[PDB]
Amino acid sequence: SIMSYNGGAVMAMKGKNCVAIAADRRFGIQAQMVTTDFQKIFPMGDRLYIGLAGLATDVQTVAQRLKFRLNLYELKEGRQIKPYTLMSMVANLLYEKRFGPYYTEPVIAGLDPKTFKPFICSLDLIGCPMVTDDFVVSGTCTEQMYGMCESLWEPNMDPEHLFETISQAMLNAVDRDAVSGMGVIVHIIEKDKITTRTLKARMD
Amino acid sequence: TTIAGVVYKDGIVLGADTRATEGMVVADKNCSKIHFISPNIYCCGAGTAADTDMTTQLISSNLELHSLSTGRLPRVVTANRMLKQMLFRYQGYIGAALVLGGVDVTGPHLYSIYPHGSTDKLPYVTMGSGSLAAMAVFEDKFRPDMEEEEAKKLVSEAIAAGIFNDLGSGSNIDLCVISKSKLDFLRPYSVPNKKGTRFGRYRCEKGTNAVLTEKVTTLE
Amino acid sequence: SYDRAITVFSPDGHLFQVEYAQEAVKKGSTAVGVRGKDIVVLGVEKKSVAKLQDERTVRKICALDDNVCMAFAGLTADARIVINRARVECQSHRLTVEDPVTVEYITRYIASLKQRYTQSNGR
Amino acid sequence: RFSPYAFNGGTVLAIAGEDFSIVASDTRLSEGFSIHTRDSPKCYKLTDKTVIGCSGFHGDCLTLTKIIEARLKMYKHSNNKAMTTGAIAAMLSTILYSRRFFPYYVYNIIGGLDEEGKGAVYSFDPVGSYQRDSFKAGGSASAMLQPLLDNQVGFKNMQNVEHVPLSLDRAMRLVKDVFISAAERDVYTGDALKVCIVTKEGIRGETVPLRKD
Amino acid sequence: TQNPMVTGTSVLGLKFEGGVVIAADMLGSYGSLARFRNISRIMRVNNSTMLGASGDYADFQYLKQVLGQMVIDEELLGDGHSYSPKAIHSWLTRAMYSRRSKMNPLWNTMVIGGYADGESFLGYVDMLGVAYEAPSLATGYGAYLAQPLLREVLEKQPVLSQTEARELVERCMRVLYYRDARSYNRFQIATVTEKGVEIEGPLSAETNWDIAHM
Amino acid sequence: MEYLIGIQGPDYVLVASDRVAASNIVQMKDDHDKMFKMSEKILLLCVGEAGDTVQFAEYIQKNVQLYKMRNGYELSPTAAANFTRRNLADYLRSRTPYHVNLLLAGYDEHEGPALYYMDYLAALAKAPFAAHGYGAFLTLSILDRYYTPTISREKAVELLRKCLEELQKRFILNLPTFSVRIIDRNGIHDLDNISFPKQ
Amino acid sequence: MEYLIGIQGPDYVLVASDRVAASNIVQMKDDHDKMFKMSEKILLLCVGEAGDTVQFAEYIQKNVQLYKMRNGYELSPTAAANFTRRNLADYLRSRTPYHVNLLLAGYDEHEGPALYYMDYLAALAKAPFAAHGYGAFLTLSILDRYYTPTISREKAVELLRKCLEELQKRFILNLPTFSVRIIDRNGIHDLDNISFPKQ
Amino acid sequence: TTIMAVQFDGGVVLGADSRTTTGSYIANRVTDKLTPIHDRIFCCRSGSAADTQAVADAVTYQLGFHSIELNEPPLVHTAASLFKEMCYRYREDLMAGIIIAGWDPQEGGQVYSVPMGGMMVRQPFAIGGSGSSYIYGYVDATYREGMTKEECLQFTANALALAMERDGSSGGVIRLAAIAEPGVERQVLLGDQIPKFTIATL
Amino acid sequence: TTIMAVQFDGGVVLGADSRTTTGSYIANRVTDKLTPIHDRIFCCRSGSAADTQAVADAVTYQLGFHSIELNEPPLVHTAASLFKEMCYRYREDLMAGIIIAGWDPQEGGQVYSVPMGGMMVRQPFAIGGSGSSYIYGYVDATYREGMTKEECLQFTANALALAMERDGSSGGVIRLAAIAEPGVERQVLLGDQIPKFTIATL
Amino acid sequence: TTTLAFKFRHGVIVAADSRATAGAYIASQTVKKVIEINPYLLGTMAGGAADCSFWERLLARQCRIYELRNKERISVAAASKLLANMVYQYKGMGLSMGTMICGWDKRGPGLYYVDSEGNRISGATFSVGSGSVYAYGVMDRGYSYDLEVEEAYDLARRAIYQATYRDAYSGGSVSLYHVREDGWIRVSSDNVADLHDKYSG
């Protein structure tokens, strides 16, 4: 109930040498839409992104506190954080509030620095990490996203096939959820470039 | 979740399923539930997954400090004592249910640890939602001083019973064999379930998705 | 709880109780209705004038509603029962339908009540 | 306390074609975290042109299927003809609303042929609100199956893709694949899949194994 | 019946080549107390059908009375028709569902075993009116402790002889004694075959306690 | 919450009611009549639970009109008020209770004007003036302050306007228009609506 | 319930708020200012739980003015909105939570006009127009229907008047007067109150 | 759970069942509920397993340190007092009924009951746990003064067997411990070694 | 309340305490809980006094009319069946645990338990009421097949005395009734006649 | 859910969305929320879909019986009164129905709001459902009694579209009906996506 207060949906998907992360764009309070360009996907590096679903206040708070800790980390160590290290840092941040939890479920998509091996993971609200090799979902329409991703995902997709797969999964999943949608943003992370797209979507 | 453990004549066999469900939906098909404590001590976990991971990580860290300080191999009793004191002080709020198995200078030891801080030292234990099916297998077929292969077959059978009769268990069987001379982390040990073969081909083609805006950032 | 069949068919196809009720009607004082272009007129004979009777109490013409009235011939007390039932029906029709009854509606109701009393046990 | 309902799991799916209808269901009967049985189809043949799939509380499913069979026989006795699919749907709506305050906890999907020989699917909610659809999923995995049916049968969110009529073989493939995907993620969907195909030739039955966990 | 007073624990059923075997311990528990230790929870319905019940024992006695009277009436008719096990199972489902729909349930879980026309029948009816058929059955904690063993054996061997089925039922009763706090080590085994229904008891499982020295 | 008000003069009764029908936060109707004409000289004003109000008022209306048809003369306002109270009180402890608050305004050729207050518990009181609603808390004191028994109907209308202006000034609810009727020896007369139109 | 509205133009932000302070059924105040001037070009509009609103708004105002005194330059509207959100979010899980709903309107010499929406949970959103209260349900669709990004300030005032007239027509609450302010490169300007005086 | 302790002239006999349940599920059928607190001092535990295990560990720690400091064998009364202080101080958080039994050079064999709530009483014999209600009459009718060690062992075995046959929360094996000046003798009665009482039929 | 009945070769022995409480107040200290249903059929009652009194009166009425109609002495099983039907039909409204004991020419001495809920079982001996929990072990260890009438009377007196000493809801006097073919012999054990079991001290 | 109706010189305009939800899950995007009671009466579906459908089908049955018995079509006020009387018997039993009965009788165009809470009011414009506040906002600004027919169609479509834009529980398609003197006609069914392409672009 609390996690569904603002709605929202985030999804990450693994390609052959690339990752994709997509989110709905609606910010609303219960049934009422407020805006249609709420940011849920934040960059934590050149090739590392975190998407946050759940309470919008906790989305913003956790993104800002993670940016705090990540900036300190990357100043103390003269290197960029690895996706596994970012996942551990996020889990520690969430578990610090074990009994007063932040109401967000993060999704992490990235490429290994200096290795460029795709990494995706999801965490629950108290920071239990789950690394997969195909896809992770988070938000208020995880059942629909699971149907779409389990049906459509294939191993070793090139970035264009990956974009089509994650786009169709997100679009058809949020078309079937009342409090998500109003546009979809997709990031495709390759080793040499990042592609950001907004999909044509239903606005009802 | 089904986790189990037995004491056989040369050591410990731990086993777990690999399914992690969120509600009634399978979230993780390949979840690792057997946790490193020390090179001679391992722990299967059930209950609140975050609690299990954090508690096992904390105890593993403390035991590493202890073994660096003493220069000796950790004892299973020390891990048991630390875990039970930590869990008792939290009065069951940390929801970690543990099967702790190891081989130390005193031999093989197997403990069940409950979230409120009670422990049982037993020759075979099961835990999780599939624990009663695995326990049924154990009570039907356990014998003391089994050989390593016999113990592995028995634990895999108990995990399989949990997998095929408990809705919260499934996917693969993972084993961890511990003796005084070796540690075998068999992941997966068995794969009794596979995704069904696809009879069709969904339409997934380039150009299928309409795009409003596009932005390409080149990385150096 | 009296469940006798009073109106039954005779061997020639007749309902003798209905015929006897008609003979009871034939003994009532004459009533005449004439329907005009802008007016409807009812007129009832008074078989005798007692010269001591309060006229207002023995009127054979009565209003069922604002737009509907009736005269009768036959038994006065049966007429009183029927008139009260029709008045209740007219009010209930004004309630459930937001309009007054047509003359044909209240006529249909009265006729169906009479028919029910020709085909029900104990009356 | 006493709760008169139980959640018994199971998924039903129906797809209407140009000259066929398909009703498919999983065969797992469960309660809580247990499995009562792995052989419990949720599809019932009503007439030679009509099949019903029922999911939810199994006691209600059994009672309702028996009530529907009785009502079909009564209609045949009274009218000297078999009930059409649309009449069955209207009657089921009345039957479900007759318990509006102590409802059958059943999700019903009727697959059949209409009077013109075209495939027809009717979906019902527990109190009898119903509508005709081209395809529909009900039960525990319905939110998993429905978006993919929208994408593949309805061609939603796809551009520059023609709307070729859905043939029987493609529909059968899609049903099998979508149920395998559901068996992956929904703990209640498993064991076996029973598929009933309704054409003018009659009703054909098929069984496809699913994973036993 | 919202509050069951004296209750019976798990009942087991198993089909085999040529019949059905059902097992139930002879305990009537009063909450946690083992108040009644020599009560039979299995009844012969007729020559082809037997029944075992978990849950409220007074409700089971009521059902035994009603079913026995129905069988007597049918035998009085003397017209060559007798209730099949399937008919008994259907009638039980209807009765339980009717009681549930009046919010006055019979607090029982029943296993119906039968052999008719060369065919074995095993049926489950719970107090909500959920009813099904299966090659093996187990109510209560047996569902968690005996049904996995029965299913594993039937998976590697779908068709069992009578001896194998009886041995398997003995092993399951032993497990239930080990792990169910409401069970007792005094049980009955009823078998329905071509020859009819035969109820054996009291019986005990052989128990091992050597792990107490480990 | 809906507003009713009645002021009884020496030879008339003046009544007014708000014309708003509301559901949740939205004014669904802005010309809603809460007055019911039982007879040529009797008005029933009813507020309260949705559905209950119209059902009870139309039941009373049907019975009063039936009385007139049966007997050839009308019920007096006191008899009608008592019949209403008896029916409401009988329904109060039954399976279909009505949650309605009522004013009964009437003129009797012999007893003069009459105004009756009835709460939903079916206590009947005769009052020289009365009001129903949350707005009664804001206007009963004005009526207490300015009312005299000999008040003329134009002074009565002015006093009513004072009460309604106070409702505009202090009441949190938007009640911009009011229906106004007067009963006297010549029957029921509809006065102009008293309205406060927003720019 | 109290009404806030903001409409952001190409080079200005127009804000309006109801002027009613209510307790129970009575309008205690009819000229109540819900706008707080953080700086020369920032307005904070706050509604919500009594006591909480003024305490939180004055705490923010003190901190923004202190920033200006310490540093010699003012906080930008985006920085102020984020400072407000951070403080509200920190208070949300503390022992003294504030139940306040906020609009932050500001003009930045480089970033132009800005309008921010904040619910009591402290989620911060940037919107071209926004509204708070039950009356937002009745006017957000009008804003959706008629707003364009290039809307001039006179057309903005006319659109605001349309929204407030809809509030007069359909909202159950009496909200007769509204305070209106506009922020641009020259600072904050008080426009004439938009009022609907009841007759 | 049924726990019991009996004093005889030169020592004590303690006995327990071995059943640990979670609801109607037996989670441990061979539980050891007789816990050595010191070389000649044992506790029988009933109630929450976590609570009794924690309290017994804490009392073992305190009693061992105290015995080292005093350079003297601990008194059974001292262990009972430590248990009583812990159980009374945390009576709102603990579910623990304890029997403390052992031998002293100063006092001989001693049995103390620390029931839930944290009161402390010395008794010639004590029973506890959920099963103990069923054997109150039996131990009242059977106990006699001056029993030997063997008579005490048989008395404890019989009472525990009767409780285990009636109480659904008790069962498994009977664990017995005889404590005297020479030392501690522990035994397990299992299977046909457990006293048998025929069920009355017909 | 503690009620008990034991079968011996030619009849039955019934026994009860005499305490009726309302909370902790003893409202009746000499209650007669052994109720004749017929010339050779008695019931012991436990639970709500109003419920058991009403049901016993109704069953007495029905059994008397039935016996007059059949011109035959009633069967103990028939009285037990009548009690069972009443207690099962109104199980949601009644709090009644009944023992029905008596003698038949066809069946001899008979004891039936109709506990709360309305089940019916024949037993060699039955106990009931709140005090009965304390003597389950005692009667399990003590009962033996083939006891005479005097042995049964002593067995019942001892068990009732033990329950009365432990159970706060039981006490007063012991009422006993021996039913055989010759008739009914009733007695009251009070004061020093009640079996005594020394409290264990030191 | 958003349904609206308004009277104007050329009749009654009725419009609705088509989305049915079950919590956050959209159960359907193709619900027909305008009930064609008979060739001369329209109703709307807000609240419980089964409740509205069932009780308006009962109303259709009663109206047909009325026409057979009286040789006259039932009036709109009479039909709405029948429905209100039918649902009042179930007050407090949990029925949820908010509907608009629309028609054209001897009294001209007729529009009544009837709900399960017992309300029954005549009016010129009504909007019912979770998205009805947004529809009210757009409709009131655009409404006049003297609209042309095409302007009225556009106003209804626009109001429903804006409601679906703001309300999470409204969406799918907009169905538009026109009640005229000789009966109603189903005007159109336009997907919200096409409406968006026509309004935003």
UniProtKB/Swiss-Prot annotation, chain B:
GO biological process terms, semicolon-separated: proteolysis involved in protein catabolic process
GO CC terms in record: cytoplasm; cytosol; nucleus; proteasome core complex; proteasome core complex, beta-subunit complex
GO molecular function: threonine-type endopeptidase activity
Catalytic residues identified in the record: T1 (nucleophile)
Keyword rRNA processing: no
EC number(s) recorded for this UniProt protein: 3.4.25.1
Record localization: Cytoplasm; Nucleus
Domain of life of the organism encoding this protein: Eukaryota
Keywords per UniProt: Cytoplasm, Hydrolase, Nucleus, Protease, Proteasome, Threonine protease, Zymogen
Reaction catalyzed: Cleavage of peptide bonds with very broad specificity
UniProt record similarity statement: Belongs to the peptidase T1B family.
Subunit annotation: The 26S proteasome consists of a 20S proteasome core and two 19S regulatory subunits. The 20S proteasome core is a barrel-shaped complex made of 28 subunits that are arranged in four stacked rings. The two outer rings are each formed by seven alpha subunits, and the two inner rings are formed by seven beta subunits. The proteolytic activity is exerted by three beta-subunits PSMB5, PSMB6 and PSMB7.
Protein task: Component of the 20S core proteasome complex involved in the proteolytic degradation of most intracellular proteins. This complex plays numerous essential roles within the cell by associating with different regulatory particles. Associated with two 19S regulatory particles, forms the 26S proteasome and thus participates in the ATP-dependent degradation of ubiquitinated proteins.
Protein name according to UniProt: Proteasome subunit beta type-7
Taxonomic source organism: Bos taurus
UniProtKB/Swiss-Prot annotation, chain C:
Major subcellular location class: cytoplasm
Family: Belongs to the peptidase T1A family.
Alphabetical keyword list: Acetylation, Cytoplasm, Glycoprotein, Nucleus, Phosphoprotein, Proteasome
Portion of the full-length sequence here: 2 to 124 of 248
Entry GO CC: cytosol; nucleus; proteasome core complex; proteasome core complex, alpha-subunit complex
Summary of the function given for this chain in its UniProt record: Component of the 20S core proteasome complex involved in the proteolytic degradation of most intracellular proteins. This complex plays numerous essential roles within the cell by associating with different regulatory particles. Associated with two 19S regulatory particles, forms the 26S proteasome and thus participates in the ATP-dependent degradation of ubiquitinated proteins.
GO BP: proteasome-mediated ubiquitin-dependent protein catabolic process
Protein species of origin: Bos taurus (Bovine)
Coiled coil regions, renumbered to chain: none
Compartments where found: Cytoplasm; Nucleus
Name of the protein described by the UniProt record: Proteasome subunit alpha type-7
Swiss-Prot record, chain D:
Coiled-coil residues: none
Modified residues (Phosphoserine): S34, S40, S134
N6-acetyllysine sites (modified residues): K176
Residues that carry a glycan: S30, S181
GO biological process, one term: proteolysis involved in protein catabolic process
Keywords tagged on the record: Acetylation, Cytoplasm, Glycoprotein, Nucleus, Phosphoprotein, Proteasome
InterPro entries: Ntn_hydrolases_N, Proteasome_bsu_CS, Proteasome_sua/b, Proteasome_suB-type
Stored CDD domains: proteasome_beta_type_1
SUPFAM superfamilies reported in the protein's UniProt record: N-terminal nucleophile aminohydrolases (Ntn hydrolases)
PANTHER family per record: METALLOPROTEASE TLDD (PTHR32194), PROTEASOME SUBUNIT BETA TYPE-1 (PTHR32194:SF2)
Family from the record: Belongs to the peptidase T1B family.
Function: Non-catalytic component of the 20S core proteasome complex involved in the proteolytic degradation of most intracellular proteins. This complex plays numerous essential roles within the cell by associating with different regulatory particles. Associated with two 19S regulatory particles, forms the 26S proteasome and thus participates in the ATP-dependent degradation of ubiquitinated proteins.
Protein name: Proteasome subunit beta type-1
From Swiss-Prot, chains F, G:
Record PTM N-acetylmethionine, positions in chain: M1
Presence of keyword Cytoplasm: yes
Sequence similarity: Belongs to the peptidase T1B family.
Gene3D superfamilies listed in its UniProt record: Glutamine Phosphoribosylpyrophosphate, subunit 1, domain 1
Signal peptide per UniProt: none
Domain of life: Eukaryota
Subcellular location per the Swiss-Prot or TrEMBL entry: Cytoplasm; Nucleus
GO biological process, one term: proteasome-mediated ubiquitin-dependent protein catabolic process
Protein name: Proteasome subunit beta type-2
One Pfam family in the UniProt entry: Proteasome
One annotated Gene Ontology cellular component of this protein: proteasome core complex, beta-subunit complex
Biological role: Non-catalytic component of the 20S core proteasome complex involved in the proteolytic degradation of most intracellular proteins. This complex plays numerous essential roles within the cell by associating with different regulatory particles. Associated with two 19S regulatory particles, forms the 26S proteasome and thus participates in the ATP-dependent degradation of ubiquitinated proteins.
Subunit organization: The 26S proteasome consists of a 20S proteasome core and two 19S regulatory subunits. The 20S proteasome core is a barrel-shaped complex made of 28 subunits that are arranged in four stacked rings. The two outer rings are each formed by seven alpha subunits, and the two inner rings are formed by seven beta subunits. The proteolytic activity is exerted by three beta-subunits PSMB5, PSMB6 and PSMB7.
CDD domains attached to this UniProt entry: proteasome_beta_type_2
This protein's UniProt keywords: Acetylation, Cytoplasm, Nucleus, Proteasome
